[PDB]
Amino acid sequence: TQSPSSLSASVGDRVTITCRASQSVSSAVAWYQQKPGKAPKLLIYSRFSGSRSGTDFTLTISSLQPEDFATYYCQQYSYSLVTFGQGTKVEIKRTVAAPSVFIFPPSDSQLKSGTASVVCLLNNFYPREAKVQWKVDNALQSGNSQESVTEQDSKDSTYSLSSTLTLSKADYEKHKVYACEVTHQGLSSPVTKSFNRG
Amino acid sequence: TQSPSSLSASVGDRVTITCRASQSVSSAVAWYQQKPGKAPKLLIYSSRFSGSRSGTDFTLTISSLQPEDFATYYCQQYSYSLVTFGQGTKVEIKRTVAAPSVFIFPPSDSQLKSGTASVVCLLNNFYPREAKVQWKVDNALQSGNSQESVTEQDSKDSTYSLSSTLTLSKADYEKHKVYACEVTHQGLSSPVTKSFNRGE
Amino acid sequence: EVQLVESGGGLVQPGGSLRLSCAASGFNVYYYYIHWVRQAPGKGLEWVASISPYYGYTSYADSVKGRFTISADTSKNTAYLQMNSLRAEDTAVYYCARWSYKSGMDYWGQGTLVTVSSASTKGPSVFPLAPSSKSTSGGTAALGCLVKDYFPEPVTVSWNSGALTSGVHTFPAVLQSSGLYSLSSVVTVPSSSLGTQTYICNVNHKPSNTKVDKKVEPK
Amino acid sequence: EVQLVESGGGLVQPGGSLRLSCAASGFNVYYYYIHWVRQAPGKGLEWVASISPYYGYTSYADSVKGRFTISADTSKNTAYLQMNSLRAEDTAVYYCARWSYSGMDYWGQGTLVTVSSASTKGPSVFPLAPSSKSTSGGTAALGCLVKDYFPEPVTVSWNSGALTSGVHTFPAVLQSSGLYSLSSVVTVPSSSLGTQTYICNVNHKPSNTKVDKKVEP
Ligand SMILES: [Zn+2]
Ligand SMILES: [Zn+2]
Ligand SMILES: [Zn+2]
């Protein structure tokens, strides 16, 4: 129904996820865990515990293990119908890590194909939140780019991000200076990467 | 149909907004400017505002950003049996990083006597807008029992302010001791935590 | 002297019906395209409907698919939007606008709020956000009012009957899972004034004819 | 061993129809409620429909109601989801699950359903070339742009799976044209670029397309 909310936590932390009871008339709640690319799993709840905060339902993880980092869904049944709550993604907390930035001009083969995509890469950073602003001949762009973010890296718990500027071939040839400007928690000043067409 | 995308800029900057078109070719455009709490305004362009069509995508250019240009811009496309507004681009004022001052408020006795409890955390005058508030009740990380909202860019110093409200039943509130909100932000080299003990 | 004034907005249960009006002045709707555009809180503009000049042909967004009807009365010089089978996602500020390379909607109404929900009208409870030793820092103290559990929007807040505006932040309302709204208004002041100056938040909730003052004192 | 196996997913035009299946094993669909749950890309879980163990009859989400119809075959224990008048919003991975009575304790592997007017099309692969200007210390970045394909999914490897460290293959984005696009990148020592070749192997099974693109300065 929508994108899951986020929660940052460390191994060993205690986490409590609250599920608001809509307008039901029973304590029929079930909790599920889902990892990327896999089906959800019904939570069987040792470190997992279910309770009742007021009229609402809660799921508590007493001490987060590495395997606990995933998206959690609260399910309420009637039982003439079923409803899933918004996902809550539990993320691994680590120290701030500034991104390294790279820009890629469109290949000659792509220009031959009638399109020009410019790619800005942000590598190995934390937290996930980062802003990329595009500039063409020093003109700030909007509405002609799209971003994409990896899942948290298994080894160092960092993120990587791509931002792609898409222009027509004809328009790409009309400008000279292409740049992406990156803003992030770990950056005291914006980092810019650029190139001159030709 | 979705939230407006955000763009940080300064006075004198050049800004070009691209209208993400569909089966256009035979399509016309109109550009609008909206500020908080007010109806949109039609933009007349040619002299600070100019526009053109690069292929199927309409563009609007602001040649030199003025203080009154900071707003949310929308493109409207219309053609045979189709009229739609594109996603809004919110052009906001860029300024130096400013860390929030953080304040926490326990539930008033008045609200407690009324059988409920709301804990409020206040983040005052910070920039940039991006900020993360994490509630902790007896060091248990909370999620799904709080809500937050943020003001528009302040007309005084171009900062934002945010309030986060942790909602609990009175009974649940009274069986926990330590309440805390942990604030993460650009201007903070380390997270700031404001807390209190129930009944002090 | 062109103006458009809207009315008819309010609360309605899902599945219910509402008729919005758009009274024109300084021109007649007969000679122009008239448009309806809506905006959900925090979201972008969404085109809803339009009616053509001279002949009054119509056009609708797919999202209001045979549920909405746009019309105009040229004698009363008013355009209408009949809304049937309303759903929660129809909740928004609705604007009407007049159309006229440089063409576009050049005149707009002030907008009217349409709320679709099963919740009933309720006035707010007002609680203090009291200043304190931990609500102060290096000279300035923060205080405010929590305006909780009201429906529908809007609520308005002022401080000391409008005399205090500096340092005031009145946040956007949030829709709680209960279906009721809540908002906070805060203000920062000098700590030394806490003993002297009095601070009162004036809350108004027209949909329930509710008026409430709350004096905010140190705990 | 309890096990649900799904099939029948794929690509369809808006207004078209598909029929999903759910082969049960280690149990029979007579003594259990069977549910259908879908998940649109990057979004949360959404309940679709359910059928009762003893008698048939049905419960549907409001978003579906009278467009899909759930059913089952007792003999060959198989649940079905007959989807008709499909819309773009119905694009999702569809799961079938068994409810015990407490909750959906067993799930199928899931199957992708795409509803769109776009035609099947293989990706054009373009190099994201390394450069002396594109380094971070001794590290160089490079990659492959996998643009304008339909439908999902594509798979990307580097040097036939020999190179995995430092690889980032980003989630696809749905462009305004109705086609998907993604990039795959890798960071390597710039000192290796002279004596090392880098090839991204792109596989798009839905279009029978296999591309291997070498990436060089
Ligand atoms: Zn251009
Ligand atoms: Zn302030
Ligand atoms: Zn990396």
Q: Chains touching chain C at 3 or more Cβ pairs under 8 angstroms?
A: B
**Dihedral angle sign, alpha carbons of residues D39, D44, D49, D53:** positive
Question: In degrees to the nearest 10, what's the CA dihedral of C159, C163, C167, C168?
Answer: 30
- The answer to whether residues B111 and B135 belong to one domain is yes
Those of residues 101-130 in B touching chain A at CB distance below 8 A are: 128, 130
d(CA C134, CA C131): 8
In the structure encoding, which two tokens stand for residue A132, read together?
């990329």
Burial A133-156 (b: 16+ CB within 10 A, else e): bbbbeebbbbbbbeebbbebeeee
In the structure encoding, which two tokens stand for residue C197, read together?
């100056």
User: Which residues span the domain enclosing D200?
Assistant: 118-217
Question: In degrees to the nearest 10, what's the CA dihedral of C67, C73, C74, C78?
Answer: -90
- The answer to whether residues C105 and C160 belong to one domain is no
Residues B117 and B110 sit within 8 Å (Cβ to Cβ):
no
- The answer to whether residues C84 and C5 belong to one domain is yes
How many Å lie between the centroid of ligand 3 and the Cα of residue D173?
20
In the structure encoding, which two tokens stand for residue A104, read together?
């890629």
- The answer to whether residues D80 and D142 belong to one domain is no
How many Å lie between the centroid of ligand 1 and the Cα of residue A118?
14
**Distance between first and last Cα of chain C:** 53
Final residue before a domain boundary, out of A60, A94, A128: A94
Final residue before a domain boundary, out of C82, C103, C118: C118
- The answer to whether residues D51 and D141 belong to one domain is no
Domains identified in chain C, total number: 2
Final residue before a domain boundary, out of A94, A112, A130: A94
Experimental method: X-ray
Burial class (CB in 10 A: 0-12, 13-18, 19+), D174: middle
d(CA D35, CA D17): 19
- The answer to whether residues A188 and A168 belong to one domain is yes
- The answer to whether residues B81 and B110 belong to one domain is no
Cis amide prior to C207 (ω within 30 degrees):
no
d(CA D203, CA D212): 9
- The answer to whether residues B47 and B120 belong to one domain is no
d(CA A103, CA B98): 29
- The answer to whether residues A151 and A124 belong to one domain is yes
- The answer to whether residues A191 and A100 belong to one domain is yes
Q: Residue B150: which of B118, B128, B167, B119 has the closest Cα?
A: B128
- The answer to whether residues C108 and C128 belong to one domain is no
CB contact under 8 A, C102 and B44: yes
- The answer to whether residues C110 and C125 belong to one domain is no
Interface A–D counts its CB contacts (< 8 A) at 127
- The answer to whether residues A101 and A191 belong to one domain is yes
CATH of the domain at A24: 2.60.40.10
Q: DSSP class of residue A170?
A: H
d(CA C28, CA C73): 10
Select the residue of B13, B87, B143 nearest A18 (Cβ to Cβ): B143
Instruction: Assess B87–D contact: CB distance below 8 Å, yes or no.
Output: no
**Closest-approach residue (CA) in chain A for B169:** A54
- The answer to whether residues D37 and D135 belong to one domain is no
d(CA B180, CA B93): 32
- The answer to whether residues A5 and A33 belong to one domain is yes
- The answer to whether residues A130 and A168 belong to one domain is yes
Which of A60, A126, A141, A142 is the mutation pick for testing B, counting most B CBs within 10 A?
A142
CATH of the domain at C173: 2.60.40.10
User: Which residues span the domain enclosing B166?
Assistant: 96-200
- The answer to whether residues C4 and C34 belong to one domain is yes
- The answer to whether residues A19 and A52 belong to one domain is yes
CA distance C183 to chain B (A): 9
Final residue before a domain boundary, out of A64, A94, A124: A94
Select the residue of D59, D95, D171 nearest A148 (Cβ to Cβ): D171
CB proximity list for C126: less than 8 A, separation 6 or greater:
C145, C146, C147, C148, C201, C203, C212, C214
Those of residues 129-188 in B touching chain A at CB distance below 8 A are: 130, 132, 134, 137, 139-145, 168-169, 171-172, 184, 186
Distance of CA B163 to the CA centre of its chain: 12
CA distance B60 to chain D (A): 19
Listing DSSP states for chain B in one string gives --PPEEEEE-TT-EEEEEE--SS-SS-EEEEEEE-TTS--EEPP----EEEEEETTEEEEEESS--GGG-SEEEEEEEETTEEEE---EEEEE----BPPEEEEEPPPHHHHHTTEEEEEEEEEEEBSS-EEEEEEETTEEEESSEEEEEPPPPTTTS-EEEEEEEEEEHHHHTT--EEEEEEEETT-SS-EEEEEETT-
Distance of CA A120 to the CA centre of its chain: 17
Strands A159-168 and B41-42: unpaired
In chain A, breaks (C-N over 2.5 A) are found after 45
Final residue before a domain boundary, out of C118, C153, C181: C118
- The answer to whether residues A74 and A21 belong to one domain is yes
CB contact under 8 A, B110 and C188: no
- The answer to whether residues C174 and C218 belong to one domain is yes
Burial A93-113 (b: 16+ CB within 10 A, else e): beeebbbbbbbbbbbeebbee
- The answer to whether residues D105 and D122 belong to one domain is no
- The answer to whether residues A166 and A88 belong to one domain is no
- The answer to whether residues D108 and D12 belong to one domain is yes
In the structure encoding, which two tokens stand for residue B174, read together?
């009274």
d(CA B143, CA A90): 10
CA distance C75 to chain B (A): 26
| Helical (H) or strand (E) element with D142 | strand D139-149
In the structure encoding, which two tokens stand for residue C194, read together?
């806490």
Cis amide prior to C128 (ω within 30 degrees):
no
Please, which residues bridge with residue D6 across strands?
Answer: D22
Q: What is the 3-state secondary structure (H, E, C) of C115-143?
A: EECCCCCECCEEEEECCCCCCECCCEEEE
B140-143 sheet: strands from edge to edge: A48-53, A56-61, A14-19, B140-143, B131-137, B178-185, B192-197
Select the residue of A7, A131, A136 nearest B143 (Cβ to Cβ): A7
Ligand 1 (ion): residues with CB under 5 Å are A 171
Final residue before a domain boundary, out of C118, C134, C149: C118
Residues A73 and A84 sit within 8 Å (Cβ to Cβ):
yes
- The answer to whether residues C107 and C200 belong to one domain is no
Domains identified in chain A, total number: 2
Which residue intervals of chain D are DSSP H helices? none
CB proximity list for D28: less than 8 A, separation 6 or greater:
D74, D77
